[PDB]
Amino acid sequence: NPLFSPYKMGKFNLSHRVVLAPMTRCRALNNIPQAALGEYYEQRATAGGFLITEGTMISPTSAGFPHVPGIFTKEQVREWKKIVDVVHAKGAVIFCQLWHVGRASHEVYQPAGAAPISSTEKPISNRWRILMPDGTHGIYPKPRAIGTYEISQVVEDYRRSALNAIEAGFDGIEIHGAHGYLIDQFLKDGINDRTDEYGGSLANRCKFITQVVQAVVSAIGADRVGVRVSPAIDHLDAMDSNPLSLGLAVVERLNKIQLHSGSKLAYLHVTQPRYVAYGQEEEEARLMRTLRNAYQGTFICSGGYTRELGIEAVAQGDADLVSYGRLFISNPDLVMRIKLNAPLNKYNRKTFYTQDPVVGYTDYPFLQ
Numbered sequence: 001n002p003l004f005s006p007y008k009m010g011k012f013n014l015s016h017r018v019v020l021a022p023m024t025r026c027r028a029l030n031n032i033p034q035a036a037l038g039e040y041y042e043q044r045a046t047a048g049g050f051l052i053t054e055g056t057m058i059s060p061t062s063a064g065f066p067h068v069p070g071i072f073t074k075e076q077v078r079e080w081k082k083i084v085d086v087v088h089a090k091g092a093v094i095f096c097q098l099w100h101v102g103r104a105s106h107e108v109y110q111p112a113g114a115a116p117i118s119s120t121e122k123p124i125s126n127r128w129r130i131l132m133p134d135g136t137h138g139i140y141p142k143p144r145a146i147g148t149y150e151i152s153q154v155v156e157d158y159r160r161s162a163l164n165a166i167e168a169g170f171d172g173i174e175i176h177g178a179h180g181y182l183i184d185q186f187l188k189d190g191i192n193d194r195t196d197e198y199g200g201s202l203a204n205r206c207k208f209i210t211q212v213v214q215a216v217v218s219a220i221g222a223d224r225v226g227v228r229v230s231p232a233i234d235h236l237d238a239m240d241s242n243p244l245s246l247g248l249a250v251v252e253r254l255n256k257i258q259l260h261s262g263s264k265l266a267y268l269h270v271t272q273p274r275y276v277a278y279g280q281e282e283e284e285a286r287l288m289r290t291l292r293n294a295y296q297g298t299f300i301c302s303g304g305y306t307r308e309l310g311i312e313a314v315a316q317g318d319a320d321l322v323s324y325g326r327l328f329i330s331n332p333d334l335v336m337r338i339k340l341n342a343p344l345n346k347y348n349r350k351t352f353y354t355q356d357p358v359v360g361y362t363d364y365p366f367l368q
């Protein structure tokens with residue numbers, strides 16, 4: 001079974017290829033990592049396994065969900081360390097995903113109820129609704145488009161948060177540049193309507209993610225930096241006229257960064273879309289294989305993977321590691337279960353974003 005052949009990700013000797021995909025669960029009350037996170041990650045950690053934390057705040061204006069952890073204050077760093085220690089004690093490797101939502105926020109999540117920032121002034125449409133602190137859904141407001149100087153301030157927040165992640169003990173960080181968020185808002189031409197040097201051409205649209213990656217690399221080293229993108233996913237009205245072209249454009253910038261920096265990134269992480277048929281290589285698969293073949297380094301595929309699809313991905317060389325989200329929610333021992341090809345617990349979406357430290361978070365049973 002390919003999923004269980006070792007894999008050397010940089011200095012990390014991974015015993016298997018099943019990865020915990022970053023997942024927002026909203027248990028980090030008031031943005032403070034909670035002991036619950038500790039038990040949650042500990043349950044899923046395995047000797048030689050790779051975990052990626054839920055997206056984490058890089059500043060006071062980077063959140064668009066309630067109770068998501070942050071890593072921009074020393075207090076948060078202190079609490080993250082305890083979680084990182086419990087995970088390391090299991091022999092797992094763990095990276096902290098640095099996340100800024102951009103225009104996908106609401107005044108309720110912004111200091112002084114200010115407007116969320118973005119590359120544009122256009123708001124997400126009403127086809128998408130934001131989750132509110134009280135569990136109901138809200139309207140995405142008009143964001144404020146930032147200038148060159150402010151862009152550099154946000155880049156600095158990523159930088160500072162990356163240093164904090166390292167101070168907390170994390171083995172590295174993952175730059176969240178997918179799913180229609182801040183970075184993705186500069187990447188997708190369906191959103192980026194700028195006329196300055198951060199908009200228009202592929203090179204300009206790629207500038208922001210490049211500056212962000214460069215800043216953290218120069219701060220903690222390319223080896224402790226992973227990057228996540230999703231050119232073919234349009235979540236939150238984040239579409240591009242040419243998904244494949246945009247992805248390759250991003251891949252080229254990353255390869256260039258590695259060559260100039262003289263070191264490879266931890267990995268490239270890509271979320272893929274899944275079409276829907278009926279009672280059930282292809283464009284989508286080929287787009288993924290193409291980004292993988294173009295990228296000089298470790299490739300992590302994600303999005304609707306199963307035990308079967310995962311084995312296939314590693315077996316055909318389409319990916320080095322496979323990240324699982326939803327199945328990892330309901331199966332703390334997903335790695336063991338996949339290895340023994342045992343049944344899988346179904347996940348209850350109702351408690352994906354509730355605040356209880358146990359219910360729908362750590363009370364999913366292990367294999368008996």
Ligand SMILES: Cc1cc2nc3c(=O)[nH]c(=O)nc-3n(C[C@H](O)[C@H](O)[C@H](O)COP(=O)(O)O)c2cc1C
Nearest residue numbers: 021022023024055271302303304305324325326352
């Ligand atoms: C409840 C939930 C929360 C998620 N939170 C994040 C997140 O904070 N950052 C991110 O990059 N992806 C996030 N994802 C996407 C996952 O990392 C992963 O790409 C996706 O779950 C893969 O598909 P799967 O659920 O079929 O395995 C989330 C997914 C779910 C279901």
